[PDB]
């Protein structure tokens, strides 16, 4: 089965450098031309660079010319993309794809990789800011009362929230993070529980932050008004 697996993506400040990789298996690597294609979050596709089976011809897009460098190693079945002087608009998922062609008019990309994300942000890594959001009379009664915690001002995206160490899974809804003009994220989670069960059920919001090892937990209980 033909497989292309990309790796090496990560966060990097503007003007920095990075190197992505793609390792193939299941076919004769040195018989084909290979490509890099990128897609910005919420945007369309864009061809980046190509390299023939023996590195004799190379092409670049006009937006990355002079800054990126494509290469391959036929003995290891891997090709690389060296990115330099990275800009803000270089934030995207990068795919490796194999060339298919009919010899004259048709040229397409039949097999695609899975993608590797690259983020170019001037912000600096910071720990999350966790606060509780106790239920209130206005937001109670009806059928059930809802209560949650708030995470604020955290740069790296992968923030995970678990309530009872994974023992609460019904009525828990998580919202997508918001990108502020300052470059920091902030996401709030809300939980729905019976109004008559208020106080009898323990609510704790665990915020685990791998890039800052900030594993904090905060109780959400009603506090008068």
């Amino acid at each position: 089965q033909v497989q292309l697996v990309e790796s090496g993506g990560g966060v990097v400040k503007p003007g920095g450098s990075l190197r992505v990789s793609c390792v193939v298996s299941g076919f004769t690597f040195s018989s084909y031309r290979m490509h890099w294609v990128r897609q910005a979050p919420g945007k369309g596709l864009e061809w980046v660079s190509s390299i023939t089976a023996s590195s004799s011809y190379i092409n670049y897009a006009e937006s990355v010319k002079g800054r990126f460098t494509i290469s391959r190693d036929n003995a290891k079945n891997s090709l690389y993309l060296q990115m330099n002087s990275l800009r803000a608009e270089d934030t995207a998922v990068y795919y490796c794809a194999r060339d298919e062609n009919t010899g004259i008019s048709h040229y397409w990309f039949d097999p695609w990789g899975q993608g590797t994300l690259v983020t170019v942000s001037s912000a600096s890594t910071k720990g999350p800011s966790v606060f509780p959001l106790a239920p209130s009379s206005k937001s109670t009664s009806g059928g059930t009362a809802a209560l949650g915690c708030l995470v604020k001002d955290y740069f790296p995206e992968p923030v995970t929230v678990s309530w009872n160490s994974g023992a609460l899974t019904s009525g828990v809804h998580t919202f997508p993070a918001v990108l502020q003009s300052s470059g920091l994220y902030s996401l709030s989670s809300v939980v729905t529980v019976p109004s008559s069960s208020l106080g009898t059920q323990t609510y704790i919001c665990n915020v685990n932050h791998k890039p800052s090892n900030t594993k904090v937990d905060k109780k959400v209980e009603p506090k008068s008004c």
């Binding site: 076919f27 004769t28 040195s30 018989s31 031309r33 023939t52 089976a53 023996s54 004799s56 011809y57 092409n59 062609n101 009919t102 010899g103 004259i104 008019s105 040229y107």
Partner: protein
Amino acid sequence: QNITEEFYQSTCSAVSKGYLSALRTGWYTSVITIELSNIKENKCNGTDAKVKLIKQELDKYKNAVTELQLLMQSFLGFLLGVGSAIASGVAVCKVLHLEGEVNKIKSALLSTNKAVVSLSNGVSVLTFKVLDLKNYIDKQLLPIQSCSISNIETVIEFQQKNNRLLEITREFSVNAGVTTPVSTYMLTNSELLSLINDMPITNDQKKLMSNNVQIVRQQSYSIMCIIKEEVLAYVVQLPLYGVIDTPCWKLHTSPLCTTNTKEGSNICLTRTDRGWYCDNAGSVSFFPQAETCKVQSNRVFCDTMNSLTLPSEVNLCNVDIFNPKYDCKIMTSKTDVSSSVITSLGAIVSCYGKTKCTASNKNRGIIKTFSNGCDYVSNKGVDTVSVGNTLYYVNKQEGKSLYVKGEPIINFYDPLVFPSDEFDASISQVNEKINQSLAFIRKS
């Protein structure tokens, strides 16, 4: 840094690698037109000197037109197969003989010199106009009645503008309307480059073709197509290189024999799969008649019509000839004669009998003497090898060579039950024959 060689002592063969592919997998056809004149023999008269030359030139032009009008009327190479080279261009001309095709091409080229015209069958061909004799003749050679010429440079201009048509007519006349190597009279370098630039291909293919124009010429055709009304048309059939920049290697083989001192009683063996091998989309293309592959530096131009499709496992024969995955092809004999094979970076010497075999260089002279058997010498410090009464010059191309030692395989056979004659056998067939012969030997 590019190309290396390896010599295998067990089989007396060598492999050169480091080359890059350019394989012709298709054809591209174009139409070339020449706008022509229908001058009648209606000149008034003349007894001048500069008018007689003009009349001779006109006679040449008319004779060429009449001639053009008269022209059109109505080992292992034996496993290849038979194709037809110019079928596509001939089909294009067969279409071009229909009713309104010539008028369509005329109407599409009056204002420009290049155009893409869609024919009645739906295929869109590229048309190009290279010469306009009608314009010159009509607007500068019939000043209303040419009975007196006042300048001599007009004669020179007219005879300069006429040479292209006479040279095309001669070429078509000595070839019966089909010239394989396309010359600069049929297409100039500027025209060929523009034609390459207009093809719907990638920029890599265009870069490959623009830097190797001589090869493109050597692999092209030109077919006399039609001359009617005031248009001369012929078709040019260009190669299409669908596969480019893949690894390719060459195989050299020489006979391998035993070295008994008696006149007979010696058995020989030779690998028969010489030629070029190139990677092609998960398999290998093998070209046995290696004489039909052109080489430019480390780029090989091979025509797929003269190839066989083989599995990628064929390469195992170089590293191990007794592997079970693939059955290598050999031939057997009893005639042991000395000879030499010149490889990319050296020479294989098979020296047998009473022959004298040596290697030398210009500064020091002889620097090696070969004994009986198969041997290899690199070209680092060797200029020539001499075998018997023959002398060879080795290629002086740069690269690295490697010597791989091993016991020759002809020593593993028993001469008593050795199959003496096998032109198109393999390892398994020889083994199975030896097994037969040896089984029948049973007493009582």
